Design a protein around this motif. Structure first.
Motif, PDB file in Angstrom:
ATOM      1  N   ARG A 188       0.848  -1.183   0.000  1.00  0.00           N
ATOM      2  CA  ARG A 188       0.000   0.000   0.000  1.00  0.00           C
ATOM      3  C   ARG A 188       0.886   1.236   0.000  1.00  0.00           C
ATOM      4  NH1 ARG A 188      -3.506  -3.358   3.863  1.00  0.00           N
ATOM      5  NH2 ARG A 188      -3.323  -1.872   5.614  1.00  0.00           N
ATOM      6  N   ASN A 189       0.515   2.237  -0.799  1.00  0.00           N
ATOM      7  CA  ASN A 189       1.398   3.385  -0.991  1.00  0.00           C
ATOM      8  C   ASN A 189       1.017   4.451   0.021  1.00  0.00           C
ATOM      9  OD1 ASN A 189       3.120   5.422  -1.805  1.00  0.00           O
ATOM     10  ND2 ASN A 189       2.272   5.625  -3.876  1.00  0.00           N
ATOM     11  N   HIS A 190       1.805   4.554   1.082  1.00  0.00           N
ATOM     12  CA  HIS A 190       1.693   5.643   2.038  1.00  0.00           C
ATOM     13  C   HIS A 190       3.084   5.906   2.597  1.00  0.00           C
ATOM     14  CE1 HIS A 190       2.313   3.497   5.878  1.00  0.00           C
ATOM     15  NE2 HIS A 190       1.759   2.470   5.259  1.00  0.00           N
ATOM     16  N   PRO A 191       3.324   7.091   3.171  1.00  0.00           N
ATOM     17  CA  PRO A 191       4.649   7.366   3.746  1.00  0.00           C
ATOM     18  C   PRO A 191       4.729   7.018   5.229  1.00  0.00           C
ATOM     19  CG  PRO A 191       3.364   9.411   3.601  1.00  0.00           C
ATOM     20  CD  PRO A 191       2.460   8.293   3.137  1.00  0.00           C
ATOM     21  N   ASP A 216      -3.600   2.683  -5.759  1.00  0.00           N
ATOM     22  CA  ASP A 216      -3.151   3.055  -4.427  1.00  0.00           C
ATOM     23  C   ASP A 216      -2.006   2.186  -3.936  1.00  0.00           C
ATOM     24  OD1 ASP A 216      -4.926   0.805  -4.231  1.00  0.00           O
ATOM     25  OD2 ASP A 216      -4.975   1.161  -2.060  1.00  0.00           O
ATOM     26  N   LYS A 217      -1.251   1.564  -4.836  1.00  0.00           N
ATOM     27  CA  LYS A 217      -0.217   0.629  -4.427  1.00  0.00           C
ATOM     28  C   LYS A 217       1.095   0.955  -5.116  1.00  0.00           C
ATOM     29  CE  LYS A 217      -3.845  -2.286  -3.484  1.00  0.00           C
ATOM     30  NZ  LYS A 217      -4.803  -2.016  -2.365  1.00  0.00           N
ATOM     31  N   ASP A 264       0.967  -3.672   5.551  1.00  0.00           N
ATOM     32  CA  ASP A 264       0.892  -2.951   4.290  1.00  0.00           C
ATOM     33  C   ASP A 264       1.300  -3.781   3.090  1.00  0.00           C
ATOM     34  OD1 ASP A 264       1.876   0.040   5.995  1.00  0.00           O
ATOM     35  OD2 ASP A 264      -0.135  -0.474   5.251  1.00  0.00           O
ATOM     36  N   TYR A 275       5.656   7.732  14.894  1.00  0.00           N
ATOM     37  CA  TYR A 275       5.494   6.658  13.919  1.00  0.00           C
ATOM     38  C   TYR A 275       6.799   5.901  13.733  1.00  0.00           C
ATOM     39  CZ  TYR A 275       3.748   4.234   9.762  1.00  0.00           C
ATOM     40  OH  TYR A 275       3.365   3.280   8.839  1.00  0.00           O
ATOM     41  N   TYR A 311      -0.019   3.484  13.113  1.00  0.00           N
ATOM     42  CA  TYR A 311      -0.715   4.413  12.221  1.00  0.00           C
ATOM     43  C   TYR A 311      -0.368   5.854  12.551  1.00  0.00           C
ATOM     44  CZ  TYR A 311      -3.835   0.485  11.139  1.00  0.00           C
ATOM     45  OH  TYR A 311      -4.348  -0.750  10.807  1.00  0.00           O
ATOM     46  N   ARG A 354      -3.751  11.003   9.133  1.00  0.00           N
ATOM     47  CA  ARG A 354      -3.392  12.308   8.596  1.00  0.00           C
ATOM     48  C   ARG A 354      -4.648  13.149   8.318  1.00  0.00           C
ATOM     49  NH1 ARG A 354       2.146  12.296   6.883  1.00  0.00           N
ATOM     50  NH2 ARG A 354       3.125  10.260   6.425  1.00  0.00           N
ATOM     51  N   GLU A 377     -10.027   8.928   7.657  1.00  0.00           N
ATOM     52  CA  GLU A 377      -9.438   7.606   7.865  1.00  0.00           C
ATOM     53  C   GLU A 377      -9.717   7.025   9.244  1.00  0.00           C
ATOM     54  OE1 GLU A 377      -5.551   8.285   4.916  1.00  0.00           O
ATOM     55  OE2 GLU A 377      -5.325   8.525   7.095  1.00  0.00           O
TER      56      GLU A 377
END
Ligand SMILES: Cc1cc2nc3c(=O)[nH]c(=O)nc-3n(C[C@H](O)[C@H](O)[C@H](O)COP(=O)(O)OP(=O)(O)OC[C@H]3O[C@@H](n4cnc5c(N)ncnc54)[C@H](O)[C@@H]3O)c2cc1C
Ligand SMILES: Cc1ncc(C[n+]2csc(CCOP(=O)(O)OP(=O)(O)O)c2C)c(N)n1
Ligand SMILES: [Mg+2]
Lengths: 89, 531
Positions: A10-13, A42-43, A68, B110, B121, B124, B128
């Motif tokens: 999953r693409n998140h920072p 989203d990946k 993830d 984090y 998690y 942000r 969510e």
């Protein structure tokens, strides 16, 4: 002697801090990393250059513990791809 | 139903059945606290140190079987949670840890939590927040449980948005082939000398584990995390194996030709030198985590599953054998093995003679803990609360506080030592103000002690930086925190009375610092090389 793993994540920072940190924390050898977002998606893909060890399926089990990580595959491309890629920079 | 982020967090926590939440307020988490003031269902316990908040959450969680929640602000609140969360990780406990964070518009909470959580998690935007919390509570409690850390920026908490949150429940356990269960049943039925090796993962299957142990008449050994899975005196109980386990059973395991490993992870402190641990034994290994199968010992049959579901499909296929000769061998080896007032063992025995099987027992870390594990008659699941994986000094008193809050009926005895008790000494206040039924049994060796034994036995220059002068009065301190105190100096009469009457108590006992936990397996040695 070497394989590429393809990880779909999953693409998140930053999922990359998760994955990189897993490899450091557990002393897995990595000899090349490439991460790219998958378009209209989203990946992202993470490709790793690993050794085809007795340790490899344990490596996969560990990686699949990460939330993830949506999938992890042995990727059929030649492992000497990574090194050759450097030529474009 | 429209909420602010903080009000949604509280509402979700209500709908998961949480009745108690423990933490400490600070700027970046004050909105949730605002919402939390309004709950008619959730009481909030104010710890004195966020490590304490986390370990109290841990005591709740280690007794309920469900996730417990702790809360802190950014910065030093978050950093103070670290030890409690990491301890939760290595012992596999369901914790949800909620921390406020600076507005999205600092300390990298984090980042710090990445290596010590089952997942974490950073919320942000508020949209969510439903999925996050629903998945956190799923993740904390499914498969192999663990802590999840949710960091929520203050500007997300004070936002408003529109949505009905249900009770997140556990993910379904893995599937497993019937051929596997058949092959294990065959190996168990054909084995000359099997032993059943229990770990902390069998904790919610006492019925079927007992049924199996007694049907096949298996000698059963337990890790430190599995004490009570069979009552101490059970005729199949090898008791605990490993570094400080019982010598007879450490030798007995080396005679095994097959070991059935349920819920254990071959930690070195139970196994010793891997390659020298039961060499002539074929192994069956059932574990809910794929990553544990073949991590340390390679099994001949490996099932990734929940132990209950496996034992359900396995017990009717296991024959009922007297295993008479193997038992004569177990007994013959036991007729060559060590055995056990205000002695350390005598103190444990005396305290046990004061309470029921209904007691909850907690410990800190050191010699007093191994002594308690060795001699206390732990006979119930989820009765024994100890920090094993991380082995955190200071776990005992806040864990006991949590256990008290989660079972107000029962008595929580906390076996502690002079060094560990000071790490979370402030939670003494927490104990008295909630008038909890926790009795600290302090074995005060005026020493660290486990270190004292390792340096004196294994390092050439002996004891260093591991002794105290003895100018600390623990009765004065516990009294100033509001606890009743005792100093054995009828002694028993004082003991039974200090245990019988309610409220938190400190009971203090001097013990010679030269006393030892035997047997000991030197670090890096085989389990057959004991002192
Ligand atoms: C000073 C000190 C001394 C110690 N001495 C000893 C000693 O002599 N002997 C000893 O044994 N330990 C000792 N310990 C504890 C040791 O460090 C380990 O914590 C312990 O041995 C690990 O036990 P375990 O295998 O049960 O691990 P745990 O972490 O308790 O068990 C978790 C395992 O169970 C699995 N699991 C969970 N739920 C399920 C399920 N439903 N189905 C299947 N599998 C499941 C998990 O996937 C994992 O593999 C000591 C600790 C300290 C600090
Ligand atoms: C926070 C922390 N620091 C250091 C250690 C290493 N350590 C393990 S046991 C121990 C000594 C335990 O002291 P004490 O509370 O006096 O228990 P005792 O041996 O006397 O029974 C130490 C220093 C630890 N486990 N945790
Ligand atoms: Mg001590």
């Amino acid at each position: 002697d070497n394989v590429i793993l393809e990880l779909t994540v999953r693409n998140h920072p930053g999922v990359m801090t998760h994955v990189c940190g897993l490899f450091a924390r557990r002393a897995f050898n990595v000899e090349g990393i490439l991460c790219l977002p998958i378009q209209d998606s989203d990946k992202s893909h993470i490709w790793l250059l690993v050794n085809d060890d007795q340790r490899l399926e344990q490596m996969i089990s560990q990686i699949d513990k990460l939330e993830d990580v949506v999938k992890v595959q042995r990727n059929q491309s030649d492992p000497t791809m990574f090194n050759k890629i450097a030529v474009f920079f | 139903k429209r909420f602010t982020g903080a009000e949604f967090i509280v509402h979700f926590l209500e709908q998961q059945g949480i009745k108690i939440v423990t933490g400490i307020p600070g700027g970046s988490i004050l909105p949730v606290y605002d919402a939390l003031s309004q709950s008619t269902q959730i009481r909030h316990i104010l710890a004195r140190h966020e490590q304490g908040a986390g370990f109290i959450a841990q005591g709740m969680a280690r007794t309920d079987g469900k996730p417990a929640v702790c809360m802190a602000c950014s910065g030093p609140g978050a950093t103070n949670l670290v030890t409690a969360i990491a301890d939760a990780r290595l012992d596999s406990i369901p914790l949800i840890c909620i921390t406020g964070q600076v507005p999205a518009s600092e300390v990298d909470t984090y980042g710090i939590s990445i290596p010590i959580t089952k997942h974490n998690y950073l919320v942000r935007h508020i949209e969510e927040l439903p999925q996050v919390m629903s998945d956190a509570f799923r993740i904390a409690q499914s498969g192999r449980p663990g802590p999840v850390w949710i960091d929520i920026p203050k500007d997300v908490q004070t936002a408003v948005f529109e949505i009905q949150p249900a009770m997140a429940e556990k993910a379904a356990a893995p599937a497993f082939s019937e051929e596997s269960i058949r092959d294990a049943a065959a190996m168990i039925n054909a084995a000359k000398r099997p032993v059943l090796y229990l770990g902390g993962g069998v904790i919610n299957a006492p019925a079927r584990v007992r049924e199996l142990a007694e049907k096949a008449q298996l000698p059963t050994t337990m890790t430190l995390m599995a004490l009570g899975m069979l009552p101490k005196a059970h005729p199949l109980s090898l008791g605990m194996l490993g570094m400080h386990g019982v010598r007879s059973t450490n030798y007995i395991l080396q005679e095994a030709d097959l070991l059935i490993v349920l819920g254990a992870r071959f930690d070195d402190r139970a196994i010793g030198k891997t390659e020298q641990f039961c060499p002539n034994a074929k192994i069956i290994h059932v574990d809910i985590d794929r990553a544990e199968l073949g991590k340390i010992k390679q099994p001949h049959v490996a099932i990734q599953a929940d132990v209950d579901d496996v034992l359900a499909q396995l017990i009717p296929l296991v024959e009922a054998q007297p295993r008479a000769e193997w038992h004569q061998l177990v007994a013959d080896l036991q007729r060559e093995f060590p055995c056990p007032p205000l002695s350390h063992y005598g103190l444990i025995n005396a305290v046990a003679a004061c309470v029921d099987d209904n007691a909850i027992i907690t410990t800190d870390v050191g010699q007093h803990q191994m002594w308690t594990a060795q001699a206390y008659p732990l006979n119930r699941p989820r009765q024994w609360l100890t920090s094993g994986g991380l082995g955190t000094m200071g776990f005992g008193l806040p864990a006991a506080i949590g256990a008290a809050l989660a079972n107000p009926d029962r008595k929580v005895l906390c076996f502690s030592g002079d060094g560990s008790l000071m790490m979370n000494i402030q939670e003494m206040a927490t104990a008295s103000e909630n008038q909890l039924d926790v009795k600290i049994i302090l074995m005060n060796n005026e020493a660290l002690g486990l270190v004292h034994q390792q340096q004196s036995l294994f390092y050439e220059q002996g004891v260093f930086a591991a002794t105290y002068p003895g100018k600390i009065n623990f009765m004065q301190i516990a009294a100033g925190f509001g606890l009743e105190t005792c100093d054995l100096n009828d002694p028993q009469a004082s003991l039974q009375e200090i245990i019988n009457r309610p409220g938190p108590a400190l009971i203090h006992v001097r013990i010679d610092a030269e006393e030892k936990v035997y047997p000991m397996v030197p670090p890096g040695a085989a389990n057959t090389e004991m002192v």
